């Protein structure tokens, strides 16, 4: 089950975060034992498309090759805290699994600057358990976590040493599909 009421960044700059560009997950922390593989690739685009706040997600397990995209419509709960639906889509935005009640995630931006961010998400999918996830993001897929984001991890009373890096997994991303999925 999820247990964290993540606190959004003071003074969060929504237009800078939701600028239409891509964020790569460089490190992740799942608080639920065996919720996450040990090796993963994930990225997201975030932007406003025709007045609607959107995310597009990509997940890839580099061992199994399991791959899926989602597009998400975000509703605002407060500054930097959202509830997102999700429909599963192919990389061109064709619907595979429609939006349905009880498929949603919460999404909280705990820290962000122009290049890095720390987020929390609680995924609810049907009758699946939930679970908390933290992710360190960067605009550069190859960037080591720096001092602004590692300090934010400590300020959230977390240990960065507990986070699992995605860097040793040869992750390759279709940035074009993530950007175009924002419109879908």
Binding site for ligand HEM (CB under 6 A): 25, 28, 36-37, 40, 42, 44, 57, 59, 68, 70, 86, 88, 97, 105, 107, 121, 123, 125, 133, 135
State the minimum distance, in angstroms, from the CB of residue 68 to ligand HEM. 6
CB of 164 to ligand HEM, least distance (A): 7
The radius of gyration computed from the CA coordinates of the chain, to the nearest angstrom, equals: 15
β-strand partners of 30: 133
| Minimal distance, residue 79 CB to ligand HEM, in Å | 18
Residue number with CB closer to ligand HEM (169 or 180): 169
Would you call 169 helix, strand, or coil by DSSP?
coil
Distance CA 116, CA 112 (A): 6
Q: Specify the residue, 17 or 86, whose C-beta has the smaller distance to ligand HEM.
A: 86
In 3D space, the residue among 56, 158, 65, 145 whose CA is nearest the CA of residue 107 turns out to be 56
**With contact defined as beta carbons under 8 Å apart, do 161 and 5 qualify?**
no
Identity of the residue, 49 or 89, whose beta carbon is nearer to ligand HEM in the bound complex: 89
| Shortest Å, Cβ 116 to ligand HEM | 14
CA–CA distance, 184 with 181 (Å, rounded to integer): 5
Position with the least CB separation from ligand HEM: 40
- State which residue, 49 or 166, has the beta carbon closest to ligand HEM: 166
| CA 18/CA 87 separation, integer angstroms | 19
Instruction: Tell me: is residue 124 an annotated ligand-binding position.
Output: no
Give the pair of three-digit tokens for residue 34: 């065996």
Annotated binding residues for heme, written as ranges, equal 59
């Amino acid at each position: 089950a999820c247990t964290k009421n993540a606190i959004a960044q003071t003074g969060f700059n929504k237009d800078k975060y939701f600028n239409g560009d891509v964020w790569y997950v460089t490190d992740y922390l799942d608080l639920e034992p065996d919720d996450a593989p040990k090796r993963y690739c994930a990225a997201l685009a975030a932007g406003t498309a025709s007045g609607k706040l959107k995310e597009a997600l990509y997940h890839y397990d580099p061992k199994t090759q399991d791959t899926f995209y989602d597009v998400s419509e975000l509703q605002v709960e407060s500054l930097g805290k959202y509830t997102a639906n999700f429909k599963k889509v192919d990389k061109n935005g064709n619907v595979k699994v429609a939006v349905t009640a009880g498929n949603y995630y919460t999404f909280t931006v705990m820290y962000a600057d122009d290049s890095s961010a720390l987020i929390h998400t609680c995924l609810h999918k049907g009758n699946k358990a939930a679970g908390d996830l933290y992710a360190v993001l960067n605009r550069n897929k190859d960037a080591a976590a720096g001092d602004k984001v590692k300090s934010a991890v400590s300020a959230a009373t977390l240990e960065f040493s507990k986070f699992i890096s995605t860097k040793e997994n040869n992750c390759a991303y279709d940035n074009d599909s993530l950007k175009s999925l924002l419109t879908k």
